[PDB]
# Entry
Amino acid sequence: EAFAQNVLSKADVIDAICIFRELQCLTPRGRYDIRIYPTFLHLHGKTFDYKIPYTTVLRLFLLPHKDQRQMFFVISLDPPIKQGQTRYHFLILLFSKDEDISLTLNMNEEEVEKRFEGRLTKNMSGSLYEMVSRVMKALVNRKITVPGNFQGHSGAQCITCSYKASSGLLYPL
DNA sequence: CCCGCGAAAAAACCGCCAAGGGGAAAACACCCAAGACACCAGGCACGAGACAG
# Structure
C-alpha cells in the first residue's frame, strides 16, 4: 500500500469492468484471474495469458457436479485459444456452491443501465458461480445452457463414464 | 453374288488417344506411451482458542 501511494503521489492515473482473482480452472489447469472488458475477457495466469473476445464465444454451459457440491462453468470457444502445440476448444471452470463473493463494477449506475440494460447493477453479491454466469450472460447475450429433464438413478444430473482413456462426467443437455 | 470400269507425270494440305480403375510409396495423422515443467494445495508449525476436565 505504501508503494502504491508513493506511485500515485507522482503519477496521473486516468479499465476492466470486474476482476475475479484466482478461479479454479480445469482446461486450462491452474488458478487464473479474469478481467472483464466490453468486448473481450483477459485470462491472466502466473505465466501464460490469453484474451478471448466475446465474438469467439459460442455457448455457456453451467453444470452441477455428480456429488451436488460443485458447479462446472464451460465456455465454448471459436477459434480455440492456442498454446504452443495445443488448442483448447472449451474453457472449463470449477466453483463451489459455498463460495460466495461480493463484486462492485468499475462503472456508474446510469452507464451500467445503458450497457447491460439493467441486467446488472453497480454492486452485487451472491454465489461465485452465479455471479460469473450472470456477468457472462449479460455480456454475451447468449443464454446459459442448463441441464435438461434428465436425472440418473443416483439422483445426479449426469453419468460417470470413460472416454479416451480418462474418466469424466457426461451431461445430457 | 463377283468382278471390272486407261497410261500416266507434278503438287498441295489433313489425318499427330484419352480414361477408369487398381496398386505402390510416400506423408499424415490417430493412438499410445513416457519425461519434464508449472504450480498449488496439502502437511507442518504456530497462535489462538475453549471446553470439558
Residues 29-31, 46-48, 164-165 of chain A lie near DNA strand B (CB under 10 Å from a C1').
